[PDB]
A paper describes a structure:
Rspo (R-spondin, also roof plate-specific spondin) proteins are evolutionarily conserved from fish to humans and have well-documented roles in a broad range of developmental and physiological processes resulting from enhancement of canonical and non-canonical Wnt signalling.
In contrast, our single structure of RNF43 in complex with Rspo2Fu1–Fu2 displays no dimeric architecture. No dimer is observed in solution for RNF43ecto, even after binding to mRspo2Fu1–Fu2, and we also see only a minor propensity for spontaneous cysteine crosslinking of the P77C (corresponding to S90C of mZNRF3ecto) variant of hRNF43ecto. We note that the residues involved in the dimerization interface of ZNRF3, albeit conserved within the ZNRF3 family, are not conserved between ZNRF3 and RNF43. Furthermore, two glycosylation sites exist in RNF43 and map to the acidic region of the β3–β4 loop and the β1–β2 clamp. These sites are not resolved in the RNF43 complex but might sterically hamper dimerization. However, neither our biophysical measurements nor our structural data for an RNF43 ectodomain in complex with Rspo2 provide any evidence of a similar dimerization mode for RNF43; a finding that argues against ectodomain dimerization having a central role in ligase activity.
Numbering used by the authors:
A (entry chain A): 35 to 44, 56 to 86, 93 to 105, 112 to 182
B (entry chain B): 40 to 141
Write the structure that this text describes.
Amino acid sequence: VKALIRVTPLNLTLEGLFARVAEISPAEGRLLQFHPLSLCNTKPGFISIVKLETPCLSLANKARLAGERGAHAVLFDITNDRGALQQLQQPAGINQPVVLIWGPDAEKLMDVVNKNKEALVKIEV
Amino acid sequence: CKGCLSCSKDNGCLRCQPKLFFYLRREGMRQYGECLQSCPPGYYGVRGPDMNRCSRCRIENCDSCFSRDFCIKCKSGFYSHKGQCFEECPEGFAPLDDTMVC
């Protein structure tokens, strides 16, 4: 089950994959990067973007905590760990949707954040 | 990427050397890790479960923390006593001639 991702300042267009652990739906919000160790133990209405390295919590529980901290949706950049996708197939019924990305799409997304020019992000199914 | 053991350009420092303190520096959209000699002003050191980390200094009218219930330097114009800061310097001892210490 695929998903569309779009980005504009106040442009980019990417693709990805929903996770079976969460509930699939659209979402909108601002783009905020989060460190993997941040999600352990900012104003709301944002779509988090977390680049996973190759542990504090399970990825599901990391996605759980992200939503519980006020996140519209969880974007996992899994370029450096493709095995993350396999371990997000088990259903947990997370509310906010968990979309996965990698490759030049993920590279592009992170450069927009790297540029430090504020921008909004949306997701369609 | 300075002071780390394992490192990424996107996440900054992932793991630290035992000698340094881990700390997530925010920058609008960006958030990258840092390993530092000591915790930055307004934070005190905490030897966490896996990592040496930095917790926010939350004492009444204190500006710099050594620990959770002990203050290094108070809000300018407040008088320090046993790691606590007071405007109304208490009845234990009076303020010293010039320096702000009861």
